[PDB]
UniProtKB/Swiss-Prot annotation, chain A:
Subunit structure: Belongs to the NTC complex (or PRP19-associated complex), composed of at least CEF1, CLF1, ISY1, NTC20, SNT309, SYF1, SYF2, and PRP19.
Function: Involved in pre-mRNA splicing and cell cycle control. Required for the binding of the NTC complex (or PRP19-associated complex) components to the spliceosome to mediate conformational rearrangement or to stabilize the structure of the spliceosome after U4 snRNA dissociation, which leads to spliceosome maturation. Its absence leads to an arrest of the cell cycle, possibly due to the inefficient splicing of TUB1.
Subcellular location: Cytoplasm; Nucleus
Note: Present with 784 molecules/cell in log phase SD medium.
Domain of life: Eukaryota
Originating species: Saccharomyces cerevisiae (strain ATCC 204508 / S288c)
Protein name: Pre-mRNA-splicing factor CEF1
Membership in a protein family: Belongs to the CEF1 family.
Swiss-Prot record, chain B:
Assembly information from the UniProt record: Belongs to the NTC complex (or PRP19-associated complex), composed of at least CEF1, CLF1, ISY1, NTC20, SNT309, SYF1, SYF2, and PRP19.
Role according to the record: Involved in pre-mRNA splicing by stabilizing the NTC (or PRP19-associated complex). As a component of the NTC complex, associates to the spliceosome to mediate conformational rearrangement or to stabilize the structure of the spliceosome after U4 snRNA dissociation, which leads to spliceosome maturation.
Compartments it resides in: Nucleus
Name this protein carries in UniProt: Pre-mRNA-splicing factor SNT309
Further facts: Present with 721 molecules/cell in log phase SD medium.
UniProtKB/Swiss-Prot annotation, chain E:
Lineage: Eukaryota, Fungi, Dikarya, Ascomycota, Saccharomycotina
Family assignment from sequence similarity: Belongs to the WD repeat PRP19 family.
Gene: PRP19
Annotated region described as Required for self-association, given as residue ranges: 54-125
Additional free-text comment from the UniProt record: Present with 11700 molecules/cell in log phase SD medium.
Residues shown, of full length: 1 to 139 of 503
Protein name: Pre-mRNA-processing factor 19
Region Interaction with CEF1, annotated ranges: 63-120
Description of how the protein assembles with itself and partners: Homotetramer. Component of the NTC complex (or PRP19-associated complex), composed of at least CEF1, CLF1, ISY1, NTC20, SNT309, SYF1, SYF2, and PRP19.
Record-annotated U-box domain positions: 1-62
Amino acid sequence: XXXXXXXXXXXXXXXXXXXXXXXXXXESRMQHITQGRTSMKIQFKTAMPPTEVLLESIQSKVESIEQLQRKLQHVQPLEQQNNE
Amino acid sequence: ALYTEYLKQRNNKKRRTPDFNDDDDTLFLEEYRRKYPRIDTSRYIPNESSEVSLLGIV
Amino acid sequence: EIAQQASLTESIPNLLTSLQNEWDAIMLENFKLRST
Amino acid sequence: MLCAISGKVPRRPVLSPKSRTIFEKSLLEQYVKDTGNDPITNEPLSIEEIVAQQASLTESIPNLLTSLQNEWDAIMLENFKLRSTLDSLTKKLSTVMYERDAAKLVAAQLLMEKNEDSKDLPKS
Amino acid sequence: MLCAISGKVPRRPVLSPKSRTIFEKSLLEQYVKDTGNDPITNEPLSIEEIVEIAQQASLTESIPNLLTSLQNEWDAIMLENFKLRSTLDSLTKKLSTVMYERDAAKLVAAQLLMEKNEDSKDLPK
Amino acid sequence: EIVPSAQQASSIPNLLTSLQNEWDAIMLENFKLRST
């Protein structure tokens, strides 16, 4: 009981010290930017591959879907003149 | 007023540019680019999983 | 009581470019509709 | 897009006003003429009960707002994965540092006792 | 007042019967669809198990600024989520450094006990 | 029994709710403007 509370109190103290070391930061800044340059490289290369793979398949389907949308805009405009 | 004046309110043109060896301000701006790029790469994964099936269904 | 939209491949833009266009398109249409 | 009774693509869709569901007119008409009911819920329905702003297709303002819910609602679960995992690591750290603090008192006494036994024995 | 998943004020809260905890309907459903369990107690729970159980509207103040607010708030939450994850990795990392010292120390006690055992034999002679 | 806060911590979500509420008027206005 006494040993359980002394460990819970110390764990809260270390938790406050961990929240204090994090709030001060937000040498070290150069490492984070380089970590992003790895990400930017790795991720955006994946993005560009995912994009161009999708684009090849989906730019065709976009045109298919987008040229169909233009048909609603003319199917509507005629609708009103006929109702009128 | 926006339509009459013919001017749209400016959005956050910040995430795109940034700069390395900045300060505490660019430390934030850098950390923003990471989390959104991870969200981006996760947001491209669930699209490619289905792929063209989700598009042709619509 | 009684739909699929394919989120674009280049889906930052949702906060900046897409949302901006939506409130432009709402603004300049109703103004033009008030003119009509 | 489908008719719920047959499963075909209905060429004359008519929606009922008791069980909200898109039926094919020619199919549902016969269902009503059999017995005055809605096929799904078995509530009463007659043939007369069955039934200027230009729209654009549902694409990626309202659809954009429901998108941002998906973003945040998913990211909120991402926080749980790290809140729950933090409560295991800190709990194992608390017991680990306690076993370290309980053991290092015994390292300090054995370093005393083994050297004291060497201090005692060598003098004799 | 708070759903124990996201931290929001729930607009359609639902309570689990395996563990007394008011969750939000959207978030608890996604978890059950991932794995049929309760997020706190890890007890076998389903969607039909849930029992559907203050609303005060925010009046920000006296619209172009509200665009930049929402930008800043998403910008802040992105970093408030990031900071909380690197801290988790480094608390686990520093925990792993303690485990090596814990097991390394109890090997060093074995040699120290031998030096005590060797001493007790010499003292008797 | 008892309060529920555990692994939660005691903004953002209501901003989107507010964005919906103002749009809800935008649609209602556009309807009555188009009818006339």
